[PDB]
Amino acid sequence: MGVVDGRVVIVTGAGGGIGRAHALAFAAEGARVVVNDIGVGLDGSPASGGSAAQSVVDEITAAGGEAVADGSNVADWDQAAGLIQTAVETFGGLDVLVNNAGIVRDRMIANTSEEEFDAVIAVHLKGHFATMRHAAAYWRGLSKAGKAVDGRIINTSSGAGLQGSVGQGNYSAAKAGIATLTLVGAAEMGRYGVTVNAIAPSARTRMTETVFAEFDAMAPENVSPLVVWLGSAEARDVTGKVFEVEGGKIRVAEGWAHGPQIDKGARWDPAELGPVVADLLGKARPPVPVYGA
Amino acid sequence: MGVVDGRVVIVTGAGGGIGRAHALAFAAEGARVVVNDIGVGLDGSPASGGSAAQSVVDEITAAGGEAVADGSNVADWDQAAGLIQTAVETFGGLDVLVNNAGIVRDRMIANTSEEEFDAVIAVHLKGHFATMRHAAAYWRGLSKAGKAVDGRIINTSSGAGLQGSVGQGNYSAAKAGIATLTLVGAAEMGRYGVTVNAIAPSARTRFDAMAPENVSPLVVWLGSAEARDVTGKVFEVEGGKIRVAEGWAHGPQIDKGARWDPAELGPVVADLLGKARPPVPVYGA
Ligand SMILES: [Cl-]
Ligand SMILES: [Cl-]
Ligand SMILES: [Cl-]
Ligand SMILES: [Cl-]
Ligand code: NA
């Protein structure tokens, strides 16, 4: 039997790249998949006939699995709600939400346009928040009604969100919001049987989506196995974790810690802080450097 | 001679609370201060006669300092650009940007409305990014022209951003974006003589340890000439306490050297988690 046999999984941005790899990986392990992607079909509507979402659905069905396309824009709060309903209406419920949809608009902070900031924040951080909001309310409602909940949220952060990435300020901020939102979700939703975790694919993992296809450590398919496992019944005791992944590597990211402290026990004179700050900083753990520095 | 004597500083949300404490603290150490606050004056427009901003400006002058009120909403991109320009047109330059403006609209994630998400993200994260973007484009300009730059950005993160805070997922996400933005800003802006740091005032911050005035001295120091070699840091502050927050670290790792089978990952993940450092808990959990 598959690792997620019978489970209903939504994957956002699943028309290509890593999201496509997750969709195929889940279906291969017995899940019924909602392939969510805004890419338009021949008629210019999201996820319709001729779309990337439908192409992935056809791959799944040709392999003997079950899937449906959905064109919700997760940055649109109401369409994110409708995405949860697509799963419930089509397949009878929802077990796993995989937040993957993203865009990049890479610029130095000093050269970032308003629209370039807004778009990256909206797709990544608002999109992840909106689906979490609506899926959690759904699962909480089942729990209130005495129903079975063993639900799973897997978010997509990045080393750029954890330690920063030069020339990717907007993207780094959004992925940082996603890492912390994962921590908070885990704390809030365990009450009604939902775990919340994140993966952070390496920057070298191949994440763009080319036309032609035919050990490659950087293949996006190498990221999905841990997502599928976290979406399984067996992963019920894992929550609030962030896993960095590439190829065959899995690394646990360890969160912000309390470093060196000093206490005056009174109000500091700003003039006296130089030696105080120098002392603290020499004693502090060296950080993981900003990516691209 | 003041610690920030002559330095031109912007404090956002400086009409009350910690933002007010910052403004007064900089002025006391000789800085010329732009008091930014959107609170309306008697005529109903932001930062006019009778406003919170102007009130604070009056406090500064009467102690013998120099300050100007500014009404810009930093969540509005164009107004953030104009806030930078106000500093430059009024005092001829900018040395320090203190991003402080903030709101809370607390809700569990499952109950958060779109407006509760959008407003919190806009004020904190967009507000912070907007001012950094415009201040950096300005400092970058001066530097590419061979002019003097010894600039400072001090952002306001929170333990909510670092470890999360229950019932405050919106706020936590915004503050996390600010923490990492501080790291990226520090890496990018050092090229043109600008340091970028953040403070995270403690939960209990409002000898009165919880008094907002206790947070300001480190911000004043960070904005000083002496602080030229401090960048990319996040300091947790309360009363007489200063603590360095230590960033995300590399924990245990395993490498199959081939693609994992999802069915085999149970013991693999169990092993990794057994070796991983226990986190600082989510606030409010
Ligand atoms: Cl992306
Ligand atoms: Cl650029
Ligand atoms: Cl609530
Ligand atoms: Cl503290
Ligand atoms: Na198998």
Side-chain angles (χ1 to χ4, degrees), chain A residues 132 136 151 153 155 178-198 236-242, chain B residues 109 163-166 169 279 282 285:
Chain A
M132 291 180 67
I153 295 178
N155 292 331
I178 285 164
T180 295
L181 175 58
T182 301
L183 310 175
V184 179
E188 288 187 4
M189 303 178 186
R191 189 170 78 58
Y192 40 90
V194 176
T195 68
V196 185
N197 292 292
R236 60 184 74 84
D237 300 320
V238 176
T239 198
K241 304 307 177 191
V242 178
Chain B
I109 291 161
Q163 285 98 10
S165 178
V166 170
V282 181

PDB file of all heavy atoms in Angstrom, chain A residues 132 136 151 153 155 178-198 236-242, chain B residues 109 163-166 169 279 282 285:
ATOM      1  N   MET A 132      -3.402  28.178   4.854  1.00  0.00           N
ATOM      2  CA  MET A 132      -3.381  27.734   6.245  1.00  0.00           C
ATOM      3  C   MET A 132      -4.651  28.130   7.026  1.00  0.00           C
ATOM      4  O   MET A 132      -5.215  27.311   7.746  1.00  0.00           O
ATOM      5  CB  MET A 132      -2.138  28.231   6.984  1.00  0.00           C
ATOM      6  CG  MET A 132      -0.807  27.539   6.466  1.00  0.00           C
ATOM      7  SD  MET A 132       0.582  28.213   7.435  1.00  0.00           S
ATOM      8  CE  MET A 132       0.303  27.601   9.097  1.00  0.00           C
ATOM      9  N   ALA A 136      -7.036  25.169   8.223  1.00  0.00           N
ATOM     10  CA  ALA A 136      -7.152  24.978   9.662  1.00  0.00           C
ATOM     11  C   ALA A 136      -8.613  25.116  10.113  1.00  0.00           C
ATOM     12  O   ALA A 136      -9.075  24.368  10.965  1.00  0.00           O
ATOM     13  CB  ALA A 136      -6.302  25.976  10.396  1.00  0.00           C
ATOM     14  N   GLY A 151      -4.376  15.701  10.185  1.00  0.00           N
ATOM     15  CA  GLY A 151      -4.128  16.592   9.039  1.00  0.00           C
ATOM     16  C   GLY A 151      -2.692  17.100   9.036  1.00  0.00           C
ATOM     17  O   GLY A 151      -1.962  16.964  10.022  1.00  0.00           O
ATOM     18  N   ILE A 153       0.168  20.091   7.275  1.00  0.00           N
ATOM     19  CA  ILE A 153       0.504  21.238   6.430  1.00  0.00           C
ATOM     20  C   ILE A 153       1.999  21.157   6.213  1.00  0.00           C
ATOM     21  O   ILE A 153       2.764  21.066   7.192  1.00  0.00           O
ATOM     22  CB  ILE A 153       0.164  22.614   7.116  1.00  0.00           C
ATOM     23  CG1 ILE A 153      -1.371  22.699   7.295  1.00  0.00           C
ATOM     24  CG2 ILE A 153       0.670  23.776   6.215  1.00  0.00           C
ATOM     25  CD1 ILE A 153      -1.876  23.996   8.005  1.00  0.00           C
ATOM     26  N   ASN A 155       4.827  23.467   4.428  1.00  0.00           N
ATOM     27  CA  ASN A 155       5.160  24.757   3.849  1.00  0.00           C
ATOM     28  C   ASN A 155       6.517  24.722   3.174  1.00  0.00           C
ATOM     29  O   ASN A 155       7.280  23.790   3.370  1.00  0.00           O
ATOM     30  CB  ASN A 155       5.116  25.858   4.941  1.00  0.00           C
ATOM     31  CG  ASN A 155       3.691  26.112   5.438  1.00  0.00           C
ATOM     32  OD1 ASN A 155       2.706  25.927   4.699  1.00  0.00           O
ATOM     33  ND2 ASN A 155       3.562  26.553   6.698  1.00  0.00           N
ATOM     34  N   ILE A 178       7.268  32.710   6.323  1.00  0.00           N
ATOM     35  CA  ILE A 178       6.784  31.307   6.190  1.00  0.00           C
ATOM     36  C   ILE A 178       7.416  30.397   7.253  1.00  0.00           C
ATOM     37  O   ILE A 178       6.698  29.625   7.862  1.00  0.00           O
ATOM     38  CB  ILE A 178       7.033  30.781   4.778  1.00  0.00           C
ATOM     39  CG1 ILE A 178       6.023  31.401   3.783  1.00  0.00           C
ATOM     40  CG2 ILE A 178       6.876  29.205   4.692  1.00  0.00           C
ATOM     41  CD1 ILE A 178       6.459  31.215   2.282  1.00  0.00           C
ATOM     42  N   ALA A 179       8.737  30.513   7.500  1.00  0.00           N
ATOM     43  CA  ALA A 179       9.366  29.695   8.554  1.00  0.00           C
ATOM     44  C   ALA A 179       8.691  29.934   9.913  1.00  0.00           C
ATOM     45  O   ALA A 179       8.342  28.998  10.603  1.00  0.00           O
ATOM     46  CB  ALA A 179      10.870  29.960   8.649  1.00  0.00           C
ATOM     47  N   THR A 180       8.526  31.204  10.293  1.00  0.00           N
ATOM     48  CA  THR A 180       7.897  31.502  11.591  1.00  0.00           C
ATOM     49  C   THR A 180       6.411  31.143  11.654  1.00  0.00           C
ATOM     50  O   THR A 180       5.916  30.644  12.661  1.00  0.00           O
ATOM     51  CB  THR A 180       8.264  32.942  12.030  1.00  0.00           C
ATOM     52  OG1 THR A 180       9.678  32.987  12.246  1.00  0.00           O
ATOM     53  CG2 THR A 180       7.615  33.280  13.371  1.00  0.00           C
ATOM     54  N   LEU A 181       5.702  31.297  10.540  1.00  0.00           N
ATOM     55  CA  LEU A 181       4.321  30.945  10.475  1.00  0.00           C
ATOM     56  C   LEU A 181       4.179  29.434  10.686  1.00  0.00           C
ATOM     57  O   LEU A 181       3.184  28.978  11.256  1.00  0.00           O
ATOM     58  CB  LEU A 181       3.786  31.342   9.081  1.00  0.00           C
ATOM     59  CG  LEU A 181       2.362  30.975   8.726  1.00  0.00           C
ATOM     60  CD1 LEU A 181       1.400  31.586   9.733  1.00  0.00           C
ATOM     61  CD2 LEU A 181       2.074  31.554   7.307  1.00  0.00           C
ATOM     62  N   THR A 182       5.147  28.677  10.171  1.00  0.00           N
ATOM     63  CA  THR A 182       5.190  27.219  10.415  1.00  0.00           C
ATOM     64  C   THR A 182       5.288  26.938  11.915  1.00  0.00           C
ATOM     65  O   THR A 182       4.531  26.084  12.460  1.00  0.00           O
ATOM     66  CB  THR A 182       6.365  26.593   9.624  1.00  0.00           C
ATOM     67  OG1 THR A 182       6.149  26.878   8.225  1.00  0.00           O
ATOM     68  CG2 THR A 182       6.440  25.078   9.856  1.00  0.00           C
ATOM     69  N   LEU A 183       6.161  27.673  12.612  1.00  0.00           N
ATOM     70  CA  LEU A 183       6.276  27.461  14.069  1.00  0.00           C
ATOM     71  C   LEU A 183       4.951  27.765  14.783  1.00  0.00           C
ATOM     72  O   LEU A 183       4.524  27.018  15.678  1.00  0.00           O
ATOM     73  CB  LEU A 183       7.391  28.289  14.696  1.00  0.00           C
ATOM     74  CG  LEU A 183       8.741  28.174  13.989  1.00  0.00           C
ATOM     75  CD1 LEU A 183       9.705  29.145  14.663  1.00  0.00           C
ATOM     76  CD2 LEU A 183       9.244  26.706  14.174  1.00  0.00           C
ATOM     77  N   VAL A 184       4.320  28.877  14.413  1.00  0.00           N
ATOM     78  CA  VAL A 184       3.077  29.271  15.086  1.00  0.00           C
ATOM     79  C   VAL A 184       1.956  28.299  14.744  1.00  0.00           C
ATOM     80  O   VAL A 184       1.216  27.883  15.636  1.00  0.00           O
ATOM     81  CB  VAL A 184       2.676  30.707  14.692  1.00  0.00           C
ATOM     82  CG1 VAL A 184       1.359  31.110  15.391  1.00  0.00           C
ATOM     83  CG2 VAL A 184       3.781  31.669  15.181  1.00  0.00           C
ATOM     84  N   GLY A 185       1.812  27.964  13.456  1.00  0.00           N
ATOM     85  CA  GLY A 185       0.789  26.984  13.052  1.00  0.00           C
ATOM     86  C   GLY A 185       0.918  25.692  13.836  1.00  0.00           C
ATOM     87  O   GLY A 185      -0.064  25.116  14.312  1.00  0.00           O
ATOM     88  N   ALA A 186       2.154  25.211  13.978  1.00  0.00           N
ATOM     89  CA  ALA A 186       2.357  23.959  14.682  1.00  0.00           C
ATOM     90  C   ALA A 186       1.802  24.059  16.113  1.00  0.00           C
ATOM     91  O   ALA A 186       1.175  23.112  16.621  1.00  0.00           O
ATOM     92  CB  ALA A 186       3.873  23.562  14.695  1.00  0.00           C
ATOM     93  N   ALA A 187       2.102  25.182  16.761  1.00  0.00           N
ATOM     94  CA  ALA A 187       1.688  25.392  18.149  1.00  0.00           C
ATOM     95  C   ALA A 187       0.174  25.513  18.300  1.00  0.00           C
ATOM     96  O   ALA A 187      -0.382  25.066  19.312  1.00  0.00           O
ATOM     97  CB  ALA A 187       2.360  26.630  18.717  1.00  0.00           C
ATOM     98  N   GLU A 188      -0.485  26.133  17.315  1.00  0.00           N
ATOM     99  CA  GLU A 188      -1.917  26.405  17.392  1.00  0.00           C
ATOM    100  C   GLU A 188      -2.792  25.229  16.951  1.00  0.00           C
ATOM    101  O   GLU A 188      -3.906  25.050  17.451  1.00  0.00           O
ATOM    102  CB  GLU A 188      -2.256  27.598  16.487  1.00  0.00           C
ATOM    103  CG  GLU A 188      -1.764  28.943  17.046  1.00  0.00           C
ATOM    104  CD  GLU A 188      -2.226  30.158  16.253  1.00  0.00           C
ATOM    105  OE1 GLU A 188      -3.007  30.025  15.274  1.00  0.00           O
ATOM    106  OE2 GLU A 188      -1.755  31.274  16.601  1.00  0.00           O
ATOM    107  N   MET A 189      -2.312  24.467  15.976  1.00  0.00           N
ATOM    108  CA  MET A 189      -3.192  23.500  15.304  1.00  0.00           C
ATOM    109  C   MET A 189      -3.033  22.046  15.792  1.00  0.00           C
ATOM    110  O   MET A 189      -3.833  21.185  15.439  1.00  0.00           O
ATOM    111  CB  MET A 189      -2.953  23.594  13.788  1.00  0.00           C
ATOM    112  CG  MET A 189      -3.178  25.018  13.250  1.00  0.00           C
ATOM    113  SD  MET A 189      -2.804  25.015  11.485  1.00  0.00           S
ATOM    114  CE  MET A 189      -2.947  26.789  11.166  1.00  0.00           C
ATOM    115  N   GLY A 190      -2.026  21.773  16.626  1.00  0.00           N
ATOM    116  CA  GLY A 190      -1.838  20.406  17.155  1.00  0.00           C
ATOM    117  C   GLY A 190      -3.024  19.952  18.004  1.00  0.00           C
ATOM    118  O   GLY A 190      -3.327  18.752  18.070  1.00  0.00           O
ATOM    119  N   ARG A 191      -3.724  20.947  18.573  1.00  0.00           N
ATOM    120  CA  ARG A 191      -4.929  20.801  19.391  1.00  0.00           C
ATOM    121  C   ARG A 191      -6.018  20.025  18.670  1.00  0.00           C
ATOM    122  O   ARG A 191      -6.806  19.289  19.305  1.00  0.00           O
ATOM    123  CB  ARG A 191      -5.442  22.243  19.708  1.00  0.00           C
ATOM    124  CG  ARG A 191      -6.530  22.387  20.682  1.00  0.00           C
ATOM    125  CD  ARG A 191      -6.708  23.876  21.034  1.00  0.00           C
ATOM    126  NE  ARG A 191      -7.426  24.677  20.035  1.00  0.00           N
ATOM    127  CZ  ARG A 191      -8.669  24.436  19.602  1.00  0.00           C
ATOM    128  NH1 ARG A 191      -9.348  23.355  20.002  1.00  0.00           N
ATOM    129  NH2 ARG A 191      -9.227  25.268  18.740  1.00  0.00           N
ATOM    130  N   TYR A 192      -6.111  20.228  17.363  1.00  0.00           N
ATOM    131  CA  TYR A 192      -7.105  19.494  16.590  1.00  0.00           C
ATOM    132  C   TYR A 192      -6.498  18.594  15.525  1.00  0.00           C
ATOM    133  O   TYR A 192      -7.093  18.402  14.461  1.00  0.00           O
ATOM    134  CB  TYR A 192      -8.182  20.419  16.006  1.00  0.00           C
ATOM    135  CG  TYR A 192      -7.722  21.755  15.462  1.00  0.00           C
ATOM    136  CD1 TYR A 192      -7.338  21.888  14.131  1.00  0.00           C
ATOM    137  CD2 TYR A 192      -7.723  22.884  16.277  1.00  0.00           C
ATOM    138  CE1 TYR A 192      -6.928  23.110  13.623  1.00  0.00           C
ATOM    139  CE2 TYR A 192      -7.344  24.114  15.797  1.00  0.00           C
ATOM    140  CZ  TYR A 192      -6.945  24.223  14.461  1.00  0.00           C
ATOM    141  OH  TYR A 192      -6.565  25.440  13.999  1.00  0.00           O
ATOM    142  N   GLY A 193      -5.316  18.058  15.834  1.00  0.00           N
ATOM    143  CA  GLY A 193      -4.755  16.909  15.106  1.00  0.00           C
ATOM    144  C   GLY A 193      -4.058  17.300  13.819  1.00  0.00           C
ATOM    145  O   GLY A 193      -3.959  16.472  12.906  1.00  0.00           O
ATOM    146  N   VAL A 194      -3.541  18.531  13.756  1.00  0.00           N
ATOM    147  CA  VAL A 194      -2.850  18.977  12.535  1.00  0.00           C
ATOM    148  C   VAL A 194      -1.383  19.250  12.855  1.00  0.00           C
ATOM    149  O   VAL A 194      -1.093  20.029  13.761  1.00  0.00           O
ATOM    150  CB  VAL A 194      -3.498  20.269  11.958  1.00  0.00           C
ATOM    151  CG1 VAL A 194      -2.709  20.807  10.707  1.00  0.00           C
ATOM    152  CG2 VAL A 194      -4.994  19.981  11.590  1.00  0.00           C
ATOM    153  N   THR A 195      -0.472  18.651  12.091  1.00  0.00           N
ATOM    154  CA  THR A 195       0.930  19.029  12.187  1.00  0.00           C
ATOM    155  C   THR A 195       1.286  20.067  11.128  1.00  0.00           C
ATOM    156  O   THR A 195       0.664  20.147  10.049  1.00  0.00           O
ATOM    157  CB  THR A 195       1.893  17.817  11.982  1.00  0.00           C
ATOM    158  OG1 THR A 195       1.788  17.380  10.627  1.00  0.00           O
ATOM    159  CG2 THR A 195       1.557  16.654  12.968  1.00  0.00           C
ATOM    160  N   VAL A 196       2.308  20.854  11.427  1.00  0.00           N
ATOM    161  CA  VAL A 196       2.729  21.902  10.507  1.00  0.00           C
ATOM    162  C   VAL A 196       4.241  21.943  10.458  1.00  0.00           C
ATOM    163  O   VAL A 196       4.872  22.163  11.480  1.00  0.00           O
ATOM    164  CB  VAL A 196       2.194  23.330  10.953  1.00  0.00           C
ATOM    165  CG1 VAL A 196       2.560  24.395   9.882  1.00  0.00           C
ATOM    166  CG2 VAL A 196       0.675  23.299  11.195  1.00  0.00           C
ATOM    167  N   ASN A 197       4.808  21.733   9.267  1.00  0.00           N
ATOM    168  CA  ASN A 197       6.274  21.644   9.096  1.00  0.00           C
ATOM    169  C   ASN A 197       6.637  22.367   7.822  1.00  0.00           C
ATOM    170  O   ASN A 197       5.749  22.774   7.056  1.00  0.00           O
ATOM    171  CB  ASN A 197       6.676  20.151   8.938  1.00  0.00           C
ATOM    172  CG  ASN A 197       6.459  19.352  10.216  1.00  0.00           C
ATOM    173  OD1 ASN A 197       7.149  19.570  11.212  1.00  0.00           O
ATOM    174  ND2 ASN A 197       5.516  18.381  10.176  1.00  0.00           N
ATOM    175  N   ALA A 198       7.926  22.560   7.571  1.00  0.00           N
ATOM    176  CA  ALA A 198       8.326  23.174   6.329  1.00  0.00           C
ATOM    177  C   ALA A 198       9.527  22.440   5.748  1.00  0.00           C
ATOM    178  O   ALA A 198      10.348  21.896   6.480  1.00  0.00           O
ATOM    179  CB  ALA A 198       8.680  24.656   6.538  1.00  0.00           C
ATOM    180  N   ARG A 236       2.758  11.664  12.529  1.00  0.00           N
ATOM    181  CA  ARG A 236       1.888  12.387  13.476  1.00  0.00           C
ATOM    182  C   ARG A 236       2.632  13.086  14.625  1.00  0.00           C
ATOM    183  O   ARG A 236       2.107  14.039  15.194  1.00  0.00           O
ATOM    184  CB  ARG A 236       0.874  11.420  14.100  1.00  0.00           C
ATOM    185  CG  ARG A 236       1.562  10.255  14.874  1.00  0.00           C
ATOM    186  CD  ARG A 236       0.527   9.246  15.408  1.00  0.00           C
ATOM    187  NE  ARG A 236      -0.037   8.395  14.343  1.00  0.00           N
ATOM    188  CZ  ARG A 236       0.531   7.268  13.880  1.00  0.00           C
ATOM    189  NH1 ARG A 236       1.689   6.834  14.382  1.00  0.00           N
ATOM    190  NH2 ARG A 236      -0.058   6.563  12.911  1.00  0.00           N
ATOM    191  N   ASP A 237       3.809  12.581  14.995  1.00  0.00           N
ATOM    192  CA  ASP A 237       4.570  13.186  16.085  1.00  0.00           C
ATOM    193  C   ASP A 237       5.629  14.173  15.660  1.00  0.00           C
ATOM    194  O   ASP A 237       6.428  14.619  16.503  1.00  0.00           O
ATOM    195  CB  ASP A 237       5.195  12.135  17.012  1.00  0.00           C
ATOM    196  CG  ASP A 237       4.159  11.243  17.649  1.00  0.00           C
ATOM    197  OD1 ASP A 237       3.096  11.755  18.039  1.00  0.00           O
ATOM    198  OD2 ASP A 237       4.402  10.011  17.725  1.00  0.00           O
ATOM    199  N   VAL A 238       5.607  14.569  14.393  1.00  0.00           N
ATOM    200  CA  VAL A 238       6.572  15.545  13.914  1.00  0.00           C
ATOM    201  C   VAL A 238       5.856  16.854  13.596  1.00  0.00           C
ATOM    202  O   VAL A 238       4.998  16.892  12.736  1.00  0.00           O
ATOM    203  CB  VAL A 238       7.251  15.011  12.646  1.00  0.00           C
ATOM    204  CG1 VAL A 238       8.217  16.058  12.048  1.00  0.00           C
ATOM    205  CG2 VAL A 238       8.027  13.694  13.008  1.00  0.00           C
ATOM    206  N   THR A 239       6.192  17.921  14.290  1.00  0.00           N
ATOM    207  CA  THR A 239       5.537  19.194  14.012  1.00  0.00           C
ATOM    208  C   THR A 239       6.463  20.358  14.365  1.00  0.00           C
ATOM    209  O   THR A 239       7.351  20.206  15.226  1.00  0.00           O
ATOM    210  CB  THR A 239       4.159  19.327  14.773  1.00  0.00           C
ATOM    211  OG1 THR A 239       3.378  20.374  14.158  1.00  0.00           O
ATOM    212  CG2 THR A 239       4.356  19.617  16.295  1.00  0.00           C
ATOM    213  N   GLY A 240       6.291  21.479  13.671  1.00  0.00           N
ATOM    214  CA  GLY A 240       7.087  22.691  13.956  1.00  0.00           C
ATOM    215  C   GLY A 240       8.514  22.556  13.476  1.00  0.00           C
ATOM    216  O   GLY A 240       9.366  23.327  13.918  1.00  0.00           O
ATOM    217  N   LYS A 241       8.784  21.634  12.544  1.00  0.00           N
ATOM    218  CA  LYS A 241      10.165  21.420  12.095  1.00  0.00           C
ATOM    219  C   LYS A 241      10.410  22.051  10.740  1.00  0.00           C
ATOM    220  O   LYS A 241       9.490  22.168   9.934  1.00  0.00           O
ATOM    221  CB  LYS A 241      10.458  19.908  11.992  1.00  0.00           C
ATOM    222  CG  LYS A 241      10.185  19.144  13.315  1.00  0.00           C
ATOM    223  CD  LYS A 241      10.882  19.727  14.559  1.00  0.00           C
ATOM    224  CE  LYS A 241      10.425  18.869  15.754  1.00  0.00           C
ATOM    225  NZ  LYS A 241      10.793  19.421  17.054  1.00  0.00           N
ATOM    226  N   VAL A 242      11.662  22.456  10.506  1.00  0.00           N
ATOM    227  CA  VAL A 242      12.077  22.963   9.206  1.00  0.00           C
ATOM    228  C   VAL A 242      13.247  22.121   8.706  1.00  0.00           C
ATOM    229  O   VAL A 242      14.259  21.975   9.410  1.00  0.00           O
ATOM    230  CB  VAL A 242      12.524  24.453   9.331  1.00  0.00           C
ATOM    231  CG1 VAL A 242      13.022  24.985   7.963  1.00  0.00           C
ATOM    232  CG2 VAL A 242      11.359  25.351   9.802  1.00  0.00           C
TER     233      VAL A 242
ATOM    234  N   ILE B 109      -4.470  31.713  13.667  1.00  0.00           N
ATOM    235  CA  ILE B 109      -4.428  31.654  12.220  1.00  0.00           C
ATOM    236  C   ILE B 109      -5.781  31.233  11.637  1.00  0.00           C
ATOM    237  O   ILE B 109      -6.247  31.811  10.647  1.00  0.00           O
ATOM    238  CB  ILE B 109      -3.303  30.682  11.798  1.00  0.00           C
ATOM    239  CG1 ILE B 109      -1.948  31.309  12.134  1.00  0.00           C
ATOM    240  CG2 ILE B 109      -3.391  30.338  10.249  1.00  0.00           C
ATOM    241  CD1 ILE B 109      -0.790  30.252  12.182  1.00  0.00           C
ATOM    242  N   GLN B 163      10.846  33.226  17.361  1.00  0.00           N
ATOM    243  CA  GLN B 163      10.409  31.899  17.792  1.00  0.00           C
ATOM    244  C   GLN B 163       8.905  31.668  17.590  1.00  0.00           C
ATOM    245  O   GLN B 163       8.395  30.555  17.866  1.00  0.00           O
ATOM    246  CB  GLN B 163      10.732  31.710  19.278  1.00  0.00           C
ATOM    247  CG  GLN B 163      12.232  31.453  19.501  1.00  0.00           C
ATOM    248  CD  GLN B 163      13.036  32.713  19.916  1.00  0.00           C
ATOM    249  OE1 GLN B 163      12.484  33.765  20.229  1.00  0.00           O
ATOM    250  NE2 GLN B 163      14.358  32.578  19.929  1.00  0.00           N
ATOM    251  N   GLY B 164       8.202  32.720  17.163  1.00  0.00           N
ATOM    252  CA  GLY B 164       6.740  32.658  16.992  1.00  0.00           C
ATOM    253  C   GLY B 164       5.981  33.041  18.245  1.00  0.00           C
ATOM    254  O   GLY B 164       6.490  32.936  19.358  1.00  0.00           O
ATOM    255  N   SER B 165       4.736  33.464  18.060  1.00  0.00           N
ATOM    256  CA  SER B 165       3.871  33.772  19.205  1.00  0.00           C
ATOM    257  C   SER B 165       2.435  33.352  18.920  1.00  0.00           C
ATOM    258  O   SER B 165       1.822  33.793  17.921  1.00  0.00           O
ATOM    259  CB  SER B 165       3.980  35.293  19.531  1.00  0.00           C
ATOM    260  OG  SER B 165       3.104  35.629  20.612  1.00  0.00           O
ATOM    261  N   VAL B 166       1.919  32.464  19.767  1.00  0.00           N
ATOM    262  CA  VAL B 166       0.559  31.936  19.630  1.00  0.00           C
ATOM    263  C   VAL B 166      -0.490  33.040  19.655  1.00  0.00           C
ATOM    264  O   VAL B 166      -0.451  33.939  20.509  1.00  0.00           O
ATOM    265  CB  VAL B 166       0.251  30.923  20.732  1.00  0.00           C
ATOM    266  CG1 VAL B 166      -1.201  30.559  20.737  1.00  0.00           C
ATOM    267  CG2 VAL B 166       1.127  29.661  20.548  1.00  0.00           C
ATOM    268  N   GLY B 169      -0.046  34.994  14.711  1.00  0.00           N
ATOM    269  CA  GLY B 169       0.668  34.475  13.514  1.00  0.00           C
ATOM    270  C   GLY B 169       0.957  35.602  12.522  1.00  0.00           C
ATOM    271  O   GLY B 169       2.029  35.635  11.927  1.00  0.00           O
ATOM    272  N   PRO B 279      14.218  23.499  20.464  1.00  0.00           N
ATOM    273  CA  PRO B 279      14.076  24.929  20.191  1.00  0.00           C
ATOM    274  C   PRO B 279      13.693  25.733  21.447  1.00  0.00           C
ATOM    275  O   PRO B 279      13.166  25.171  22.417  1.00  0.00           O
ATOM    276  CB  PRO B 279      12.907  24.970  19.193  1.00  0.00           C
ATOM    277  CG  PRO B 279      12.049  23.773  19.550  1.00  0.00           C
ATOM    278  CD  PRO B 279      13.064  22.703  19.975  1.00  0.00           C
ATOM    279  N   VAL B 282       7.743  28.343  21.282  1.00  0.00           N
ATOM    280  CA  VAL B 282       6.869  29.404  20.775  1.00  0.00           C
ATOM    281  C   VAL B 282       6.311  30.186  21.979  1.00  0.00           C
ATOM    282  O   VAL B 282       5.826  29.603  22.969  1.00  0.00           O
ATOM    283  CB  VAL B 282       5.721  28.813  19.917  1.00  0.00           C
ATOM    284  CG1 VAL B 282       4.825  29.897  19.364  1.00  0.00           C
ATOM    285  CG2 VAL B 282       6.293  27.957  18.777  1.00  0.00           C
ATOM    286  N   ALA B 285       2.775  29.432  24.086  1.00  0.00           N
ATOM    287  CA  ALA B 285       2.411  28.026  23.974  1.00  0.00           C
ATOM    288  C   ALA B 285       2.291  27.383  25.357  1.00  0.00           C
ATOM    289  O   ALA B 285       2.773  27.922  26.353  1.00  0.00           O
ATOM    290  CB  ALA B 285       3.432  27.294  23.153  1.00  0.00           C
TER     291      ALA B 285
END
